[PDB]
Amino acid sequence: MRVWVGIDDTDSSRGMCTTYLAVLAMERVERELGKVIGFPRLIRLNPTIPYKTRGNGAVSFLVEVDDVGELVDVVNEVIIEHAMLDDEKTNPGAVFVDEELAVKLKPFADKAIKDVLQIDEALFVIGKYFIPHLRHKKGRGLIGALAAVGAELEDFTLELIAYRYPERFGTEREYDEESFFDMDYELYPQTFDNVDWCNDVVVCIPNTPCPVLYGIRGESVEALYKAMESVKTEPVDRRMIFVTNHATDMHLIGEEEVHRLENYRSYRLRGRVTLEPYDIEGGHVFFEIDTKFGSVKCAAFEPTKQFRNVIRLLRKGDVVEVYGSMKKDTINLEKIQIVELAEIWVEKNPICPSCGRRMESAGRGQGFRCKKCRTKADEKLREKVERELQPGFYEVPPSARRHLSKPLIRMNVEGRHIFR
Numbered sequence: 001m002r003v004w005v006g007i008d009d010t011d012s013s014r015g016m017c018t019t020y021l022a023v024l025a026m027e028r029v030e031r032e033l034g035k036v037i038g039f040p041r042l043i044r045l046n047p048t049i050p051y052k053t054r055g056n057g058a059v060s061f062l063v064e065v066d067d068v069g070e071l072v073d074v075v076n077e078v079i080i081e082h083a084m085l086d087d088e089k090t091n092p093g094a095v096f097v098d099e100e101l102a103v104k105l106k107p108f109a110d111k112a113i114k115d116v117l118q119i120d121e122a123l124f125v126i127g128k129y130f131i132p133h134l135r136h137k138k139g140r141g142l143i144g145a146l147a148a149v150g151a152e153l154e155d156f157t158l159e160l161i162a163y164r165y166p167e168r169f170g171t172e173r174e175y176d177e178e179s180f181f182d183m184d185y186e187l188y189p190q191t192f193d194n195v196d197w198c199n200d201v202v203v204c205i206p207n208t209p210c211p212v213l214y215g216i217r218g219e220s221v222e223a224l225y226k227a228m229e230s231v232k233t234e235p236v237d238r239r240m241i242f243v244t245n246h247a248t249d250m251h252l253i254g255e256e257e258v259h260r261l262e263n264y265r266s267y268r269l270r271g272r273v274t275l276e277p278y279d280i281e282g283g284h285v286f287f288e289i290d291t292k293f294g295s296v297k298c299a300a301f302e303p304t305k306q307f308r309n310v311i312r313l314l315r316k317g318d319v320v321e322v323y324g325s326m327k328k329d330t331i332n333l334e335k336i337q338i339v340e341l342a343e344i345w346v347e348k349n350p351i352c353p354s355c356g357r358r359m360e361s362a363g364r365g366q367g368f369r370c371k372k373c374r375t376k377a378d379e380k381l382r383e384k385v386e387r388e389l390q391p392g393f394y395e396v397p398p399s400a401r402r403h404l405s406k407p408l409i410r411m412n413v414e415g416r417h418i419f420r
């Protein structure tokens with residue numbers, strides 16, 4: 001039969017990773033049991049949750065087998081040899097779900113991406129549907145695993161994950177940098193978010209002791225493969241294309257959907273600036289806006305870098321739409337649409353028609369003049385201020401992008417200010 005397998009919470013900060021484990025499980029399945037139908041899926045889940053370190057994606061894949069139990073046995077064996085069971089934050093979970101049952105898991109997945117789940121909820125479902133499963137310690141990985149199976153993808157994207165040879169690991173990656181930029185120039189946007197031009201920093205390359213060499217995000221299989229032969233790196237051992245929910249904003253909740261705002265959720269909401277932007281310790285810029293939910297703290301953190309500049313150009317009254325996560329009662333800006341800019345009438349002194357300098361007061365009710373010449377005016381000149389802010393959309397730079405964060409280049413809308 002066809003059976004969805006879902007895994008996660010397998011890696012540790014030490015140097016394993018769900019997906020690598022999944023690739024192994026896949027390889028072992030093909031040779032013992034059956035074959036993998038289509039591609040595996042890398043499903044990003046609610047990104048505010050603690051216990052990440054880092055990112056938050058479970059993995060799933062479809063297979064064809066004669067016996068469910070053996071398939072469980074195989075996955076089970078793979079976990080036992082590869083999973084970082086030593087760590088206390090690592091808590092592998094796995095599930096095995098009939099095809100026509102995964103659909104019943106869509107709401108659960110959705111709550112996993114947008115909301116917060118308890119283990120008892122995952123456990124309730126497994127008993128509800130007699131879903132064969134593996135819980136290895138704390139059965140926490142079970143949530144992500146159910147989710148990796150229920151997730152419906154309307155918009156989806158691809159990532160070509162390259163993997164290192166084990167003898168390398170914990171060592172420093174070796175790679176040709178220009179090799180990557182060149183590739184982005186050639187194929188962007190087909191492949192996207194794989195490098196940060198404006199910050200001369202490659203982005204698809206982890207800084208971490210795991211098996212991943214590079215993960216390249218893109219749109220088609222043909223473009224990804226082009227990316228792969230175009231790039232120069234230390235020997236690639238394992239490679240896998242994943243269908244994902246990277247770059248879809250699948251985690252954002254519309255304001256029309258909710259009564260109050262909550263920590264550990266992410267939003268798209270519209271407001272008018274109350275407080276003006278004010279800088280902070282690390283290099284942060286705070287400000288506040290009025291919304292159907294009252295005053296709300298919006299922040300661009302230092303890692304957003306230049307994106308802070310676009311923000312600093314904010315003035316009370318501005319109509320805005322923000323995109324980001326709420327933690328500690330503040331919105332971490334990922335994206336931002338300035339809808340309507342606030343008009344500001346100002347009455348200043350007359351400019352002198354000869355010299356160009358502002359006329360000084362001519363005394364109480366004596367109008368104005370420009371002593372330097374024999375020139376005079378009697379009234380003030382009103383005008384509208386002209387700041388360097390165009391309406392429309394602005395995003396953080398690719399080196400600050402969050403896995404779920406939908407990048408402008410992928411949104412049809414107008415006014416997109418993609419900086420390169």
Ligand SMILES: Nc1ncnc2c1ncn2[C@@H]1O[C@H](COP(=O)(O)OP(=O)(O)CP(=O)(O)O)[C@@H](O)[C@H]1O
Pocket residue numbers: 008009010011016017018045046049051052053054055056057058089090091111112113114115116117118140141142143144145
């Ligand atoms: N919305 C949610 N509510 C509650 N728990 C959730 C959740 N989304 C995921 N989880 C669970 O939290 C744990 C996630 O931590 P995990 O270790 O698996 O990193 P994951 O994808 O983030 C990682 P990495 O690439 O390093 O290897 C999982 O057990 C997962 O099932």
Ligand SMILES: N=C(N)NCCCCN
Pocket residue numbers: 192193194195203204205215216217398399400401
């Ligand atoms: N996998 C990529 N191509 N980009 C990932 C972005 C990571 C930024 N911290």
Ligand SMILES: [Mg+2]
Pocket residue numbers: 008009010011012018090
């Ligand atoms: Mg994990």
Ligand SMILES: [Mg+2]
Pocket residue numbers: 007008009010018056057058059144
């Ligand atoms: Mg996971």
Ligand SMILES: [N+]
Pocket residue numbers: 102103104105106149150151152
């Ligand atoms: N589904």
Ligand SMILES: [Zn+2]
Pocket residue numbers: 352353354355356357370372373375
């Ligand atoms: Zn003058």
